[PDB]
């Protein structure tokens, strides 16, 4: 019955203001004691609580973030809004809205605390990235097989895909012929504000002289495609 | 106050019974909830008020505790339970979450194969250098990787990335990337990453001398 959906901008620039909206169905914010809250998860990290608003317009904010956070609601529209001023790259996260139950009430009086002690339903999440940078295609460099890259009868080779914005980048090997042993790593956002990733595959070192390995990189955001042939040191 | 969750990570197999626990800096009565998060999904409520099963949540989940020690318990692990788990306290503002507890598929300890890759000449021409250290197909997930240049420990100029646990062999892979300006790179000879892992007797060093042909 209860559904929550976040909406807002995918990319915001630093020093700017981020406004996010929760639209819900299946409850009303005039329900007694009902709350709506915001939580964020930085990429690869744990959840952090940001703010809550109740049906009585009571609101509370994270202390570390209080200064930059404003929470407001419209009961008629079934929406809640979070505003964050002065964004910075720290604030890149997936942002969730969640519903908190009001207390058990009998005939309009609260009789039990217990249901309140959780956020029952969450939205799917909205991912927001804070970067000052502009769309850019990657440079692709070879990670080349060698003695230093050989263990037993197996060798490793790969492509380093460096300095691109935004996500995402898709990588294939040999036009899709080679899938086995391939590991493509998740991108890391570097100090530049620009992403980097690497894709590697492990193969027979018997095959090194004989077989040719090419990595295919597609960055649709900037219409950049690269085919990089990787060969031994 | 802070919520400390133990363990950070644990390994298990289907049909296992596991127990995650949460300790609070101060008493939070019973205002403690537990959530399960599957990768790419939003957290989902398991237990509220410390011991109350959310309507619609499999009976295999259960919770206990009051005050400062709390425990979530799955009696029979199912596949969809390989996930990350969080507790939250709602007795004080702000409503603190715990640090999380990753629950992965158990398998045989497997030492990482370690590879090192010097920067390419192509990249060097561009004016930067990136040295890459690969740790391939290992288990469990805990790995420590150190960078040494001419025996100097590199702090804060490398970044790691890890794959999700492989669906077939149930291992992880890890990349570590040291980044230097071309100029700096050329002032030094010995490039080394040292790897510590449960399946290594001693820490493994993989190195190369710059410009050696």
């Amino acid at each position: 019955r209860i559904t929550l959906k976040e909406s807002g901008p995918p990319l915001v620039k630093p020093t700017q203001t981020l406004t996010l909206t929760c639209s819900f169905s299946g409850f009303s914010l005039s329900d007694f004691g009902v709350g709506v809250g915001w939580i964020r998860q930085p990429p690869g990290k744990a959840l952090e609580w940001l703010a809550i608003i109740y049906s009585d317009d009571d609101k509370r904010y994270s202390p570390s973030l209080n200064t930059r956070l404003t929470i407001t609601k419209d009961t008629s529209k079934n929406q809640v809004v979070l505003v964050m001023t002065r964004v910075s790259p720290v604030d890149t996260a997936t942002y969730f809205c969640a519903h908190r139950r009001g207390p058990t009430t009998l005939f309009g009086v609260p009789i039990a605390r217990g249901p309140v002690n959780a956020m029952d339903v969450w939205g799917q999440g909205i991912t927001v990235t804070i970067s000052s940078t502009s769309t850019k295609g990657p440079s692709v460099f070879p990670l080349a097989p060698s003695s230093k890259s050989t263990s037993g009868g197996t060798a490793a080779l790969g492509c380093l895909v460096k300095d691109y914005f935004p996500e995402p980048v898709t990588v294939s090997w040999n036009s899709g012929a080679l899938t086995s042993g391939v590991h493509t790593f998740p991108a890391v956002l570097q100090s530049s504000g620009l992403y980097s990733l690497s894709s590697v595959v492990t193969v027979p070192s018997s095959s090194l002289g004989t077989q040719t390995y090419i990595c295919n990189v597609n960055h649709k955001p900037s219409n950049t495609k690269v085919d990089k042939r990787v060969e031994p040191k | 106050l802070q919520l400390t969750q133990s363990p950070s990570s644990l390994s298990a197999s289907v049909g296992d019974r596991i127990t995650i626990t949460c300790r609070a800096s101060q008493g939070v009565t019973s205002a403690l909830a537990w959530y399960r998060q599957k990768p790419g999904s939003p957290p989902q409520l398991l237990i509220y008020d410390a011991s109350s099963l959310e309507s619609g949540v499999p009976s295999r989940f259960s919770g206990s505790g009051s005050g400062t020690e709390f425990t979530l318990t799955i009696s029979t692990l199912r596949p969809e339970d390989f996930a990350t788990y969080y507790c939250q306290q709602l007795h004080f503002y702000p409503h603190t979450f715990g640090g999380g507890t990753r629950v992965d598929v158990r398998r045989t300890v497997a030492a990482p194969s370690v590879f090192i890759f010097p920067p390419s000449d192509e990249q060097l021409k561009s004016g930067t250098a990136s040295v890459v250290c690969l740790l391939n197909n290992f288990y469990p997930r805990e790995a420590k990787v150190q960078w040494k240049v001419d025996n100097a420990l590199q702090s804060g100029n490398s970044q790691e990335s890890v794959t999700e646990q492989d669906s077939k062999d149930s291992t992880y892979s890890l990349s570590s990337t040291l980044t230097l300006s071309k100029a700096d790179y050329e002032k030094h000879k010995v490039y080394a990453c040292e790897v510590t892992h449960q399946g290594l007797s001693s820490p493994v060093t993989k190195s190369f001398n710059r410009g050696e042909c």
Binding site: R60 | T29, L90, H91
Partner: peptide, 11 residues
């Protein structure tokens, strides 16, 4: 001195 939750003082 943390602020108590909204319902911390309810049974």
């Amino acid at each position: 001195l943390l602020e108590l939750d909204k319902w911390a003082s309810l049974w």
